[PDB]
């Protein structure tokens, strides 16, 4: 329809304020075309013209389905903007009007209502919880209450998954516990669907739900999703691997029993690839995940050893992006803090000393503290074998003693005390 292309806001207002439903329809279509242009769509000019209450009333026009669709699309693009722009849509009374449109017999209208509510919920915790209080979850889940997800239109299913992921998103506060329990069986079902975009957004939803206290993690782990998350951890698509690794990383911040479920599902077999992944963010999050597994029980540290992951940790400590190296330093300090003497001895035999010492040259106070604590734990294990001199020589040979010597004359209190202590105790 070339007749509704490049209208001015003034003309859109004239059409919408006419007492003619057809003129209102043409002007609403003209508004959605303005609001869907790639170059700076005039969202604030449409808001200032007072058009949001008119679009919201058009949502209720059951007799005119095209004006319901055009106004839903126009409002979706306004709600997609800034928090102030989403607020203007919510202030117009759009939330219950969009929820009423979820049960529409027109699939393209229903989908637009799903999209709009995803944008509103996606703004933050308060609008997410307001969408929930207006009762969006029951009609949203009803749209997915089919025997096989493959019968639904692809774009439609992707929009439903994405909107459900925004209802799972954000913290302070986290989503209501009862809302999470209501959504989780549909989420577990979407996590087994064959579409890469549905899988990515399902993983993102699971990653938000596992980002919190152990009670929140427990809700997810009890649904038996960990084996599916580990399978997706092995996917070829980076948009699937990224949220799958984030969810797994979040679960291992939980209890040692919750971490054990990740190990039992076969997650450690994927870490040789994840710890050498060419995408730095995958390497960083894989090493962060490793740090929270090495912070566990001695039998869990043993499974890290058995899977041949200690040479991979030496590798990341030797060469990686600094942020990944900082996570590796944490993984080593956690391993040395909770491991057996035999496990700590193994770490030295894998060559941890030289890369650990080279990272003392870093201009980061926290990594220096983490490495010095790891050295203390390594010496503590060497004290139990009477091999402190053998370790002292190894540290001296790679130029590690010269780096600890300079750390005695360091600005930070913790660095000064730990380095001075190591030299007067072992050098």
């Amino acid at each position: 329809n070339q007749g509704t292309v490049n209208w001015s806001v003034e003309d859109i207002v004239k059409g919408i304020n006419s007492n003619n439903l057809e003129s209102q329809l043409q002007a609403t279509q003209a508004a959605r075309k303005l609001l869907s242009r790639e170059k700076q769509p005039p969202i604030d000019n449409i808001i200032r013209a007072g058009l949001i209450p008119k679009f919201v009333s058009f949502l209720g026009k059951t007799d005119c389905s095209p004006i319901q669709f055009e106004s839903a699309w126009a409002l979706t693009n306004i709600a997609s903007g800034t928090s102030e722009q989403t607020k203007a849509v919510v202030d117009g009374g759009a939330i219950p009007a969009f929820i009423s449109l979820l049960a529409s017999p027109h699939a393209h209208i229903s989908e637009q209502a799903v999209w709009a509510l995803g944008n509103i919920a996606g703004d933050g915790s308060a609008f997410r919880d307001l969408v929930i209080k207006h009762g969006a979850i029951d009609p949203l889940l009803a749209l997915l209450a089919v025997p096989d997800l493959s019968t639904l239109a692809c774009g439609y299913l992707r929009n439903l998954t994405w909107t459900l992921s925004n209802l799972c998103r954000n913290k302070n506060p986290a989503p209501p516990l009862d809302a999470v329990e209501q959504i989780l069986p549909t989420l577990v079902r979407l996590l087994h669907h064959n579409d890469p975009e549905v899988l990515a957004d399902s993983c993102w939803a699971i990653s938000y739900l596992t980002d919190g206290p152990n009670e929140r993690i427990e809700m997810v782990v009890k649904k038996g999703v960990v084996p599916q998350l580990v399978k997706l951890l092995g996917a070829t698509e980076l948009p699937i691997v990224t949220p799958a690794l984030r969810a797994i990383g979040n679960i291992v911040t939980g209890t040692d029993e919750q971490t054990q479920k990740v190990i039992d599902a076969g997650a450690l077999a994927v870490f040789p690839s994840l710890l050498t992944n060419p995408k730095t963010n995958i390497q960083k999050e894989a090493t962060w995940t490793m740090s929270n597994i090495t912070a566990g029980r001695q039998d869990q540290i043993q499974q890290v050893v058995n899977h041949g992951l200690v040479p991979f940790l030496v590798g990341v400590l030797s060469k990686a992006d600094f942020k990944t190296q900082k996570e590796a330093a944490w993984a080593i300090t956690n391993y040395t803090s909770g491991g057996t003497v035999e496990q700590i001895v193994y770490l030295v035999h894998c060559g941890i000393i030289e890369p650990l010492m080279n990272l003392l040259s870093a201009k980061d106070t926290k990594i220096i503290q983490v490495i010095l604590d790891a050295i203390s734990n390594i010496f503590q294990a060497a004290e139990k074998l009477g091999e402190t001199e053998k370790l002292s020589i190894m540290i001296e040979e790679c130029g590690g003693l010269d780096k600890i010597e300079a750390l005695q004359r360091h600005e930070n209190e913790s660095v000064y005390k730990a380095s001075l202590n190591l030299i007067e105790k072992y050098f």
């Binding site: 869907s36 769509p41 979706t76 693009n77 903007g81 703004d123």
Partner: peptide, 6 residues
Amino acid sequence: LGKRKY
């Protein structure tokens, strides 16, 4: 990934 326009 937050909000999306159509």
